Amino acid sequence: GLTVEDLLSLRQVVSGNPEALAPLLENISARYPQLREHIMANPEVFVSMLLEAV
């Protein structure tokens, strides 16, 4: 349930800049409390999300 702006960053970091994960993941999870519960129960959903819009 993310924004257009964040999903763009996340895909770009994951794909070509994984060295930049730490601060991005620090930032994103602090701004999306729900994500925690999402990843834990539905990791596959999160996966396919990232694999999309390419």
Partner: protein, 502 residues
């Protein structure tokens, strides 16, 4: 306080936060390996890299099948792989240092402060990667990735291998400082990415690192690529070695590289408990975009044997929570050794001459429960069952324990024509298992299912599904809903839906 840092143990809140962050980070890394593995398959790139490999060398990569002695074919394969390694050194003309720890493990302290400072980042799009590989420019990770791409161009079944380094959620320290002495040299001592190649003649995956360690090995028990030494494992903790193949397969290949998978590594994996097991399986499935092959069968047989031959660990710590073995002294008070079984091995205790501990296989340990405890699993005792053990309790008391075989599945009586349920002394039905629902009945769970059933004036029974344990001094039954006859389900469901009109 000073006593807080002397402890050097974080809060329980932090524990959980680290566990979640570990997962999130892992998933991202695994997804990165998936995507990067796509890039490697690039058609524009492969037509270019193909030309790096002479005809003579190509033939070595695809030797003739040798009937009398298949080993000779393996030999020729390995020779091809070696020459490929050599001309790749020739191709890769500039190697960069990792700017900041590359994809090696970060400390929690590092992660906390990473959010603190905004660093400039040069973006890397798919095209840049391709251009860098063809021109031969980049850090050691990009190098091996390029290499896997070359082998695939030559139509060899080459996997990209990624050793995933999320931060260690087992590390419960507040202060997570590292030794600066020879920090870089120790970090790069073992690689994060490498290559595996399938050998159809001996039917095994061959391990290939053409960049860092510059070797080719056929792993039996020991691998040159598994990090060794306390220093090295501070930035390289081997726990998730993942293989990505040509056809978009994704396999957890750690078993090959961890000598002590079951004893050491397991402890450090999210997989150490039932939930994490299922959770990890979910991530893998999500990245595994192909059908099973005969090759998978071979590799699984290899893994099954590696598991069989790891055997008992040398040390007491490593036997805490092992999946296969238990120390005599760790058998729970509520467990027994199955009749006719004994130890299956021993442990020499380091520090005491001739001191030895008895080690049991878990398949030979039986779990016992009390009568009440079985009822909580919807089970009663068989006629003329004898208890296997007797144990103390609380304000003592002698509780008897029984084995699963002494138990029977509890089948509750059916509801009457009018829909009447038979209920306990408090006027409720106990339903701790699907089994515990009467055959002609159904369980309806809802905060208002009782209010509903009373309004329809129909025949029901409140359902005690579990017990909330709380402060004061008092246990409490959780009446989470309703048991009604089956034919009254939709009536109940309609009323529930219309609760506001009651």
């Amino acid at each position: 306080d000073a006593r807080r840092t002397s402890r050097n143990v974080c809060s329980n809140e932090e524990r959980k936060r680290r566990k979640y962050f570990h997962m999130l980070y892992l998933v991202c890394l695994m997804v990165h390996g998936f995507i990067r593995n796509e890039w490697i398959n690039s058609k524009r790139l492969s037509r270019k890299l193909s030309n790096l490999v002479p005809e003579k060398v190509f033939e070595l990569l695809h030797p003739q099948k040798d009937e009398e002695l298949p080993l000779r074919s393996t030999r020729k394969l390995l020779d091809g792989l070696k020459k490929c390694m050599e001309l790749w050194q020739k191709h890769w003309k500039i190697t960069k240092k990792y700017d900041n720890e590359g994809l090696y493990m970060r400390t929690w302290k590092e992660i906390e402060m990473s959010a603190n400072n905004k660093r400039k980042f040069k973006t890397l799009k798919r095209s840049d990667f391709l251009r860098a590989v063809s021109k031969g420019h980049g850090d050691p990770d990009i190098s091996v990735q390029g290499f896997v791409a070359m082998l695939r161009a030559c139509n060899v079944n080459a996997r990209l291998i990624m050793s995933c380094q999320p931060p260690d959620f087992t590390n419960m320290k507040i202060d997570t400082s590292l030794n600066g002495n020879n920090a870089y040299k120790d970090m790069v001592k073992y690689p994060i990415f490498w290559c595996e190649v399938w050998d159809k003649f001996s039917k095994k995956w061959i391990t290939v690192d053409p960049v860092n360690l510059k070797t080719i090995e056929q792993v039996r028990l020991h691998s040159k690529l598994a990090p060794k030494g306390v220093a090295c494992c501070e930035r390289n903790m081997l726990r998730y070695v993942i293989a990505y193949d040509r056809k978009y397969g994704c396999r957890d290949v750690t078993r090959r590289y961890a000598q002590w998978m079951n004893s050491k590594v397991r402890k450090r994996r999210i997989t150490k408990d039932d939930f994490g097991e299922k959770w990890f399986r979910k991530v893998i499935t999500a990245l595994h975009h192909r059908k099973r092959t005969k090759i998978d069968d071979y590799e699984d047989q290899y893994f099954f044997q590696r598991d069989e031959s790891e055997g008992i660990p040398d040390s007491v710590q490593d036997l805490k929570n092992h999946p296969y073995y238990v120390l005599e002294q760790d058998i729970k008070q509520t467990q027994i050794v199955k009749p006719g079984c004994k130890e299956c091995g021993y442990l020499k205790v380091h520090g005491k001459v001739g001191k030895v501990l008895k080690v049991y296989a878990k398949r030979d340990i039986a779990d016992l429960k009390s009568a009440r405890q079985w009822y909580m699993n919807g089970r009663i005792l068989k006629t003329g069952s004898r208890c296997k053990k007797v144990i103390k309790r609380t304000v003592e008391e002698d509780e008897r324990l029984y084995s699963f075989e002494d138990t029977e599945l509890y089948i509750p009586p059916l509801a009457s024509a009018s829909g009447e349920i038979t209920k306990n002394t408090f006027g409720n039905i106990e339903v701790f298992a699907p089994t515990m629902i009467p055959g002609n009945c159904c369980l309806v769970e809802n905060p208002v299912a009782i209010k509903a059933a009373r309004f329809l004036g129909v025949e029901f029974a409140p359902a005690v599904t579990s017990f909330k344990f709380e402060r004061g001094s008092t246990v409490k039954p959780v009446l989470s809903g309703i048991v009604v006859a089956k034919w009254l389900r939709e009536a109940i469901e309609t009323a529930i839906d219309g609760i506001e009109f009651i």
